[PDB]
Amino acid sequence: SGFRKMAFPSGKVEGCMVQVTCGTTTLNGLWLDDVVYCPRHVICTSEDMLNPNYEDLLIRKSNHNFLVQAGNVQLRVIGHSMQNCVLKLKVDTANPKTPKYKFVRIQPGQTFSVLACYNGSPSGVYQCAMRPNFTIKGSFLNGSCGSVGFNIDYDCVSFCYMHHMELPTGVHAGTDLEGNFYGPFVDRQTAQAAGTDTTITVNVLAWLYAAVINGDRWFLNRFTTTLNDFNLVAMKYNYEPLTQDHVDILGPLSAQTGIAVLDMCASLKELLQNGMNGRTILGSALLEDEFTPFDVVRQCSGVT
Amino acid sequence: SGFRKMAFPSGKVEGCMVQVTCGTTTLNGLWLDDVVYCPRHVICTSEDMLNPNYEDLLIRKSNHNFLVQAGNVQLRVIGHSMQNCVLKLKVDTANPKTPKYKFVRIQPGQTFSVLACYNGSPSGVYQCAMRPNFTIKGSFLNGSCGSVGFNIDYDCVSFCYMHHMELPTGVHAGTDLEGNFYGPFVDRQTAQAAGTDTTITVNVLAWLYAAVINGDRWFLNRFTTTLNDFNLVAMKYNYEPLTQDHVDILGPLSAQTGIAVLDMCASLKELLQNGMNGRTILGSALLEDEFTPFDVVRQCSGVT
Ligand SMILES: *CC(=O)N1CCC(C(=O)N(C)C(C)C)CC1
Numbered sequence: 330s331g332f333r334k335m336a337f338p339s340g341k342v343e344g345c346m347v348q349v350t351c352g353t354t355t356l357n358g359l360w361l362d363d364v365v366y367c368p369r370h371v372i373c374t375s376e377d378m379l380n381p382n383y384e385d386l387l388i389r390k391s392n393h394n395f396l397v398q399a400g401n402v403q404l405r406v407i408g409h410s411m412q413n414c415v416l417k418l419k420v421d422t423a424n425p426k427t428p429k430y431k432f433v434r435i436q437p438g439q440t441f442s443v444l445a446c447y448n449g450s451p452s453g454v455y456q457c458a459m460r461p462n463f464t465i466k467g468s469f470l471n472g473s474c475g476s477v478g479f480n481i482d483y484d485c486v487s488f489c490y491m492h493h494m495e496l497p498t499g500v501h502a503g504t505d506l507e508g509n510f511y512g513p514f515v516d517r518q519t520a521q522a523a524g525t526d527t528t529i530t531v532n533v534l535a536w537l538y539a540a541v542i543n544g545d546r547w548f549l550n551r552f553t554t555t556l557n558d559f560n561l562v563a564m565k566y567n568y569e570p571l572t573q574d575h576v577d578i579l580g581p582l583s584a585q586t587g588i589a590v591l592d593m594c595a596s597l598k599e600l601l602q603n604g605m606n607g608r609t610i611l612g613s614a615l616l617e618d619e620f621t622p623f624d625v626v627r628q629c630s631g632v633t
Numbered sequence: 634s635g636f637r638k639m640a641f642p643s644g645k646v647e648g649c650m651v652q653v654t655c656g657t658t659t660l661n662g663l664w665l666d667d668v669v670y671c672p673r674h675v676i677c678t679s680e681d682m683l684n685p686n687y688e689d690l691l692i693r694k695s696n697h698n699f700l701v702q703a704g705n706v707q708l709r710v711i712g713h714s715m716q717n718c719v720l721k722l723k724v725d726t727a728n729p730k731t732p733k734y735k736f737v738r739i740q741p742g743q744t745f746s747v748l749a750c751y752n753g754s755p756s757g758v759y760q761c762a763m764r765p766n767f768t769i770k771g772s773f774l775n776g777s778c779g780s781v782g783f784n785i786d787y788d789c790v791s792f793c794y795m796h797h798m799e800l801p802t803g804v805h806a807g808t809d810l811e812g813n814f815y816g817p818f819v820d821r822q823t824a825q826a827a828g829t830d831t832t833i834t835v836n837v838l839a840w841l842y843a844a845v846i847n848g849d850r851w852f853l854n855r856f857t858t859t860l861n862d863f864n865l866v867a868m869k870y871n872y873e874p875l876t877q878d879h880v881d882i883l884g885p886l887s888a889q890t891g892i893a894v895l896d897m898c899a900s901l902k903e904l905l906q907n908g909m910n911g912r913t914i915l916g917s918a919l920l921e922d923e924f925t926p927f928d929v930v931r932q933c934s935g936v937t
């Protein structure tokens with residue numbers, strides 16, 4: 330028993346973190362095979378960040394301007410290209426610690442682990458979700474850019490996020506490893522505001538299943554609901570509308586606990602309308618939406 | 634900006650996790666140099682767990698009964714001793730991935746990362762504290778025993794916890810790596826109940842500093858207090874009494890924010906007496922006590 334906000338083990342990704350320096354800017358890169366991935370804004374002066382033309386800024390850059398350091402050993406840059414908002418620096422040496430890996434673009438509501446790095450040195454690991462507004466709620470100081478988010482499928486690391494931007498509201502924006510930003514965000518120091526941070530309904534329900542499974546059951550009630558009735562309450566409370574697909578995804582947890590998804594919806598409804606009344610569920614005083622159904626099954630079954 | 638519940642990177646500890654099988658029982662071991670550490674209850678049948686005499690049970694065990702498997706490679710056990718509540722199995726091969734390390738017995742209120750393992754395979758990582766009642770609030774299914782808790786001081790892993798016991802209330806008990814349990818707990822399936830789970834006052838104050846530092850300031854008020862006045866309120870709310878030592882420890886965070894520790898105490902006091910009124914601090918609806926002052930400084934400065 331016990332249910333905790335759990336990151337994947339960081340080992341396989343630690344061995345992929347390098348320091349990238351361009352001019353006076355130092356941030357983090359991902360070394361997979363003979364390529365280092367990093368945010369293209371490594372080339373910018375704070376001045377440039379206001380309205381940078383990245384193609385033009387890049388012309389003033391050669392392979393030898395990108396200083397790449399794996400721990401205390403320098404890597405020879407033999408090539409550099411811009412893919413969308415990332416730089417791919419070709420090095421002469423393939424990372425000997427490259428795991429099996431994919432680049433995956435995750436949907437909002439999907440969760441991943443972030444290995445926060447400074448100067449290509451890992452400092453910590455924590456679990457995130459891609460918010461429905463395409464922000465993430467990270468911990469990123471200066472030097473943390475190029476820190477990546479990932480899932481591990483046993484041995485295969487699916488890289489889903491590279492950190493680029495802090496919005497003035499202290500939320501975080503970044504790219505998949507093909508350099509495409511999540512949501513409407515850009516590597517420009519401009520007026521960019523996050524949209525509504527909606528709650529990931531399916532994730533809250535998963536976490537309610539997780540709680541029942543771990544003995545926190547006080548919020549089970551006698552009521553059921555429909556998708557249409559439940560969604561009226563979702564709407565009012567800035568929750569993602571719940572689909573039959575979400576219901577299907579919660580099936581396995583339904584099965585295990587013998588609680589119909591819609592009964593659990595009715596529990597969530599009451600919790601939204603009435604709050605917690607100063608009570609806690611899995612040591613939390615609000616409704617956690619950064620566990621997927623998959624995260625719950627994983628941690629409640631014990632997959633490695 | 635951003636402040637998240639952050640575990641140390643797991644890499645250095647992943648390379649220390651092995652599977653230990655004795656008879657039908659499989660759990661996790663820590664391989665440092667030519668020694669594998671594991672909970673002595675690996676030798677018990679569920680039957681034995683009711684009133685085991687570990688010295689006597691051990692006599693029926695030889696080196697060759699302890700099957701030790703690092704990934705897919707078996708280790709030859711050439712020795713086995715009981716230290717308190719741990720077994721130390723001497724293997725013929727020193728772990729090539731042994732980091733610099735210490736064994737440290739942590740005080741309650743001190744935080745550490747747990748690498749949850751099943752069959753010596755890491756599944757996830759999460760941050761904990763040693764609770765003032767000497768429980769921890771983990772995520773541990775069957776097979777998770779021998780999972781360890783640790784701090785990293787740059788390159789030196791301080792191992793502070795090995796997981797042994799789930800109490801029927803779903804909280805967790807274990808040993809330092811010398812085999813001595815935290816608190817009054819024993820490796821016996823008996824009536825063991827956790828004492829009062831008091832809140833770690835100094836940790837809540839650190840986390841209040843962390844919030845100010847990250848722009849969550851609504852709970853700053855016009856009031857100050859004394860240790861003696863504040864402690865009256867602590868008492869009533871099952872908070873650790875605050876000492877001058879706690880105040881001294883919060884000095885650096887005081888300095889940085891220019892908020893006197895006692896003013897921040899007065900903020901905590903109001904929060905205790907009045908609650909949150911449905912507001913959140915660093916995305917939390919209750920007062921977080923599993924960040925130390927040291928954890929806050931680390932994550933707010935960006936140490937690796
Ligand atoms: C996130 C990160 O590590 N990063 C982005 C900001 C950058 C900086 O301080 N500025 C504004 C200049 C472009 C140097 C440092 C790298």
Ligand SMILES: *CC(=O)N1CCC(C(=O)N(C)C(C)C)CC1
Nearest residue numbers: 658660677678679775776777778
């Ligand atoms: C925690 C763990 O992995 N562990 C302790 C319980 C044990 C078990 O299932 N029992 C009760 C018997 C002693 C086999 C498995 C190992």
